[model samples]
Target: RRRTCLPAPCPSAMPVELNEPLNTLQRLCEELEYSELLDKAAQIPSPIERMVYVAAFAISAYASSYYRAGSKPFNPVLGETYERIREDKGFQFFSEQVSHHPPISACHAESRNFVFWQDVRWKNKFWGKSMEIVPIGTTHVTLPVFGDHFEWNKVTSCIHNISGQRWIEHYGEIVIKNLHDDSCYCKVNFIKAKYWSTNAHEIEGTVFDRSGKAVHRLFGKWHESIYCGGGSSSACVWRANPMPKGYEQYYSFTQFALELNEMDPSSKSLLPPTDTRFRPDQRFLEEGNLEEAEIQKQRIEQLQRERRRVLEENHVEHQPRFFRKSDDDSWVSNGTYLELRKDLGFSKLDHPVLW
Candidate 1:
């Protein structure tokens, strides 16, 4: 069977029939499999063991976007939010679209052992036959147990032949560093395939220590498993397991992966009006009403553009409710949601949520 192609110069509104209605912000949540990562990291006492899972989690995050490569996720409206409470995993994740122009999104997740947060902005450009998206900003993770903090940025993603069988590729360096220790870091290089190369998703790198020496050599593919080897030895020190296959309506997600976007039916009253899952456009699309969905999508986008124009003309400042800008200009969580969740008995102080 052949896949149908959209016309050249892709339209502002992606063809609803060709893509899922999920917003890009909501798509970020799909990468938060931190509960299992954290649990595995916790059981192991060695810092190297914990760092292995951390690196694996980071690679897994990149993999989440691969299955849906070349497709546009809906752009989130300003102030739109998404929340996922993994009560079984003992963690919660939240995200919000804080800016309209340049389209910035902020996300924070809390777990018993670590807190993770990131502010993302993507720069997309179309070059006739190919499209490229450069993700801006860094992802931060803090582990309370070892007092370790890691931060890293994503590689650039590109797709060729958007009108036909899309050829997706990610290429760049991903460096994960432990902020407290200057020399502790992992450098993974995503090597792009040559024109006639048969291999795809090939990656190779090394993990360095405080002295800036390579302690472990890492090798793997984004869609498969990654392994680490110490010194000149060929024996594997640690290896990541391949991600599971998708199920049912979630054609690109596993059963556990789908949980990242699951909404708690019991917490409806606590959800904000602008929650992503509750967006009329997304709901209509999910119900297979493309006509209604397209209308709502256009209406929301037009309203947002108008709001941005009016605010700019009036010299009004746009403020994010749960995040504040720091002296360095990075958006940081205000801990308001942490308190709100606690008050609602959705979270507790004993087991802090990962930021």
Candidate 2:
């Protein structure tokens, strides 16, 4: 009667595998012991040096994984190649935020004029180009490409090439010398062409930094249909063809610059002190009177969540978790184009080749 039924101490559940079967736990144990031997590595005072050590450790982990099975000898070069291959497949070892490394500029009271463009790409036509506008009443504007320590003229050539029956324009063919003062880098040559009697103008476009870093294009609502596919005489007019709805150019530019400023170390140096004061609001975290850092962190998390959700939702249709061949197959590390296709969730119906 006094025995109050104590819930049978939740029967100790079997230790489920959190990662791949520990086929090489012995190797891991040895590595952990070896890591202990290098405790002094952690004592490195320089941040850069410490980071280098961490990178070495990371690389060694990959090597260890391959060696655990004793199938092949681990070649450092091969390991490096494997890493590059993974990186090309969109496996990143570090955050994109690491690209933002420029020191904050303290200068103020300096104002500059700039022309903003929407980078776009037309499928199967052009790879990339930017839409440039001469700020109200100005026929031409000087575009500057900021670098690690200085700003250089980017737009050197601008012309509308009119070959009989074909209309083409190449704009913003600018070049700027490198900081070493030895060579120069060319920004993407902005080009657009239209064939005669074919009202359909196929133009490809994209944005890039002087260092050739790609700036991904995010499509917005179509302001107007400039022209149809047929050969039409009407030069269609539209406002910000790729501009997102409800976003003003000024606000858009501010947001774009802020994003670039975050990723481009060069932009960070040229930015005025006040520019540093402006920060994007965190879309996820809720805190009253939050600092710029907190807001930035939240914004980053929001963007990451959005990206993850896109992949998860799209991929789920192709590989439903409940219908998997095995539970282990549920864990995927995208390694090849096929893996990418699966990871991106391209269904057989949507993309037959992927099937």
Candidate 3:
């Protein structure tokens, strides 16, 4: 029998004042930390050593959302793209929203030593008092030096007590594996906070060898820092940096964090108009023009729906520029920028735009 309780007002009904210029797809790119992990992984020559840093980096990605908890990011329209190039770090990132009804985002990034890519599909549900977001698909990373490939999936994110204090939590298991050798893998379990428990954001797990022997024990809070190994040998594998307060706006970001959205002034004329940074709605929101932001937001959404209707009427198909479907029907990035750039007579220094 269903218990009779007053339906809590949906927390989403509250108006949000936008302060950041990022959409959901661009926000996802922030997870990469712009080569911090790749740079660390590159320093270590051994495959095992590289995996240690990679695992820590992967965990740190989850912590990136700590400051933005409970805030909704704008959903990118189909064909909307975002790119970030960090010449100083030798890193580049590009992403495109490919599907609308069942929103799917495909992204690819590469640094001097590593190539990373993923296609994200999320399923969301509203339960009156709370909302849940379950991310689908796997993230893939490759270390050319060691010929090692790493793959893992994100955890389920939940927002609870919508009418009261919105509490956000990420809980689930993440398994990192080297496709070249199944024997080496890391299993991490994110433990949700319990009423009786003293800790929140606790994570515990082990890095194991093919023989199933534990090589390193992992422990920590995702919003704090993660440590690996034992008493005599323990070391902090990853640590969350201090996040800026809501009022500070984007000025307090670290150099690398700021670079994630920076475009090269030298190549400004060469940038494609479809880039997320060029979105009028996002720009309005960033400038704190809520009224204009909403107006433009609705206009763009309507246009996108019209385009979808036309495509559907003609029975047209949509295809991604840099990602292709595999035998399992999963979208995989083909790392086509290198070839596409050369074919177009563009230099590596040019902005990473599909068009």
Candidate 4:
């Protein structure tokens, strides 16, 4: 039997369009998701709204896990290693501190409390890195006082043959035997205070090539501060809080040195305590001290004016290099691979903490 066929639905009136799925995917791709979110958050000036956006963004990666499979591999061996190492005294203390308190709180607690320190003997074989901070160029001058006694022969012998022979002849003699030590009897002005302090006790001189460039730095101890002792009986903080067992000898030596420096031998008059009151000058006794006060005020103002002038002059003379811009100056560009490669110069990889 021939049945009447239902009229075919019009293309525009269809319940579902052929291109709907493709359009939906394209819209999803073009949403400007991250950028739009950032822009909207920035446009909001309220502190609360800003905080909410920050919290939402922080948890975004966690939310992304739902769309992907979990990929983090579990390491039972590393977990067990950490547990065992945490049992060691030094690490045990660190672990206890971290678990009990915030970093600052833990550090404060450590400063106040006394704990026995067990000697740790650790020998790890791994490729490590070190640096020799050599000052560039030969702009240093040596003082004549120190030049006379330095062992130039020993100094020259240490230099490699390639330039050592030539350098000794050009420079009158290898005057600076050990540039690294401040006490090395030779005064070489080429080195900085920091370098001198590092090698304070070593050969008082540092090594320089023919070009006058500092090649090596000697490291050593330098002076700390000087204090004064009076009739008042006060004990040193170290004496009150004894250092860990092995450090007792060092603490004793340091305390002895401090006491020696504090004893004043000269008969110089001690200044009045800071809270003492002043009397009017005898010449202004009739005027009741007004004139003396004015004189002192004028003197203070004059000194302040001089100090301000000196500061202004210094500020102008040593203005920052960036204050003047050069058209030829090159900028560091992140996008251009060659420019970044040029800036980096070389690549280095460091070993992980664990063996």
Candidate 5:
């Protein structure tokens, strides 16, 4: 049974600070959902055939969004970094909180076969009756062996009945295009939800070949399954795994997400001092110590603010250590992670002393 967290402020309080990091980590963990597609994508892969897998991968990213409602992740400190290395998945992922004002996060993932990266600036607006969050950035994936690059952007989400029902809906379209062959692309439409309907999360799209002809038709619920080539030989490309039993006690996380914050001797040996896993508030809250965590967050953020004040006094800027803005205008990893990780030099890397 999940321990009862401190009584909700005599009203209510969510552990918002624990969200983003777990979601980010979950994406890397769920990469295996389409890893098979990437493997098959490495061979003879015509742009059209590859686009099917690419489209499925794009849709898979939002599957976890279904469980995310009022609760969201904590805002990471400037220069804070998170890393995930999965031997079974054969890919290592790294993310760094690059900016504080506009709140930007830069992430990169690789496994020799492909590379996926993005720099996202999260912006939000409150309309009283509703709240809107528009993620600003483009995501890119490149298959190294074939020199195939795919690009796409995120959509907007709205939280309706903000202080009431607390439902989230994603709207807009995701156009995934293969840069190697300009004519090949996939466009998926996220239909916005309404009060009267039962088909809330449905998505429909088409994958076109180099000749600009529709080759595969796609249909599915963004939070459930994605089907491809459904005219006669219908096949679902991706299906979300079930959530763990009694997940409500843990903020409704899926099985994959549950492993994100786990710290044991093996995992701790690989982390740097600035890792998000070391955040005191998050660790305490996860262990059902909301009373202890209640004040810890304030203490941490105050410490972080003091660091910012000092930087201002020194006329210096907070620069991210793990990533650098490339000529493409996106934060790109400096490629020193593997070597640093191998030599256990992460401990020696210069970084902001975040609480």
Candidate 6:
């Protein structure tokens, strides 16, 4: 039904079709699948050393897309929630589809040393050959130890050769700053593969100290490892995890991506019904039943449309249960999710009927 639109030219251009099944919520999940870095940042005695890990953690968020493309992440139904509690990683991540028109996903993740959050809205535009997606939101990482809070916005992502063998490129500058202390920060540049070939997939940046002098130089392939020279003895702060065996058959998913949809015996019985783990269509796709997945997908879409219609007809609004709008530009959590979750198997939470 969305096929009749005329071709719109972005500053660049692409369109794509996909067979892989994942959810947009999972993309939000993978951004911090490696919060171990954050916990590490909390321990460092050197201020500059800790900031380097934070920068690497920020870059780590985009590493999954390096080998992943052509797969469409499922559009999450409104109120759809995803919670990932990684015991090994020492953090719990949660997200909820908070808005429909602008399509925002409000998320919160926390561990002993740090807490992270974002309310991301993607501004997607389709050109004739490529798609440019700009993430509109700021991501925050707070380390309560020294009262250090870092914030940065994500860069632009362009999907190239959509109709051919699809690949993705990130080509925008992401600047992360210690919000409490303005002079300390890092600026990373994601340069697109050049025609010259040498700069292909290159990332280069500098970390500045209180004097505003570049104290450390960061260089490497964003999809590989980031190494810093100066103030750190040129070490690899972050490296992409090797893809699992037979990864190509499944959207080149990192092991973490594959785990996003899983409801282990531990969490399956404890989560609310609105959780994305209960999404039937994604489950069908996971089981390799494309026909059934398609049918179920359409069913869920229509049901959401009817729900919106009825709610609008009544002049009613769907308030998100976990997140609250702090302003026109931010959604902060209500700070009681885990507490309430422990009370009644999360069944006491008010949630809309989302498929």
TM-score of each: 0.85, 0.17, 0.85, 0.15, 0.90, 0.92
lDDT per residue (tens digit) for residues 1-355 in model 3 = 2111111211222233533456667767877763577777877876665677888888888775655554677788877777776566577777778777789888888787888888889898988888888999898988887778899999998877854366678899999998986757988898888988756888887888888888888889887898888436988888887664432345233333444544456655544556776778666665566677777777887778787778789998766555677786677666674455436433433232222
**Tens digits of per-residue lDDT for model 6 on 1-355?**
1111112211110112254456777788899867888989999877787888998899889899877766778888899988888777888888899988778898998888999999999998878888999999999999999788999989999988875477788988999999887757899999887655745678988899878899888888888999989954778888888888767656677888877777676557878788888998777776666667778888888888899899999999988988999966599888867667767547776678887
What's the candidate order when arranged by decreasing lDDT? Answer: 6, 5, 3, 1, 2, 4
The lDDT of model 4 is 0.20
Error of 1 at 153 (Å): 1.2
Instruction: Compose the digit string of candidate 1's lDDT tens values, residues 166-224.
Output: 77788999999888767468888999878787788877877788777878777888766
Error of 4 at 344 (Å): 2.7
Tens digits of lDDT, candidate 2, 1-355 = 1111111111111121111111111121212211321233335543322222222221222222211121111101100111011221122110001000110000001012211111111111222342232211101111122211112232221122212222223234322222422222222232333445433222222223345543322111111121211123222211222333332211222111112112234333322221211223311111122344244444444554564466578883222111112242221122232243335432322211100
Local accuracy of candidate 4 as per-residue lDDT tens digits, 1-355? 1111111221121112111111111111111112222233344454323222222221121111111111111111100111101111121111011110101001000101111111111121212321111111111111222221112211111111222121100111224332433332322221222323433211122334445554333222112111111135321111011222332222111221112112122311221111011111111221234345345434433453464467478883211111121252211111222232235421321111111
> Cα deviation of 292 in candidate 1 (Å)?
0.9
- Give the winner by TM-score: 1 or 5: 5
lDDT of each: 0.70, 0.22, 0.71, 0.20, 0.74, 0.81
Candidate closest to the true structure, highest lDDT: 6
1 versus 4: better lDDT goes to: 1
Off by over 4 Å in 3: 1-20, 245-259, 262-264, 338-355
Give the clash count for each candidate.
9, 10, 1, 13, 3, 4
lDDT of 4 at 308: 43
Deviation (Å) of 234 in candidate 2: 38
Q: Which sections of candidate 6 miss by over 4 Å?
A: 1-19
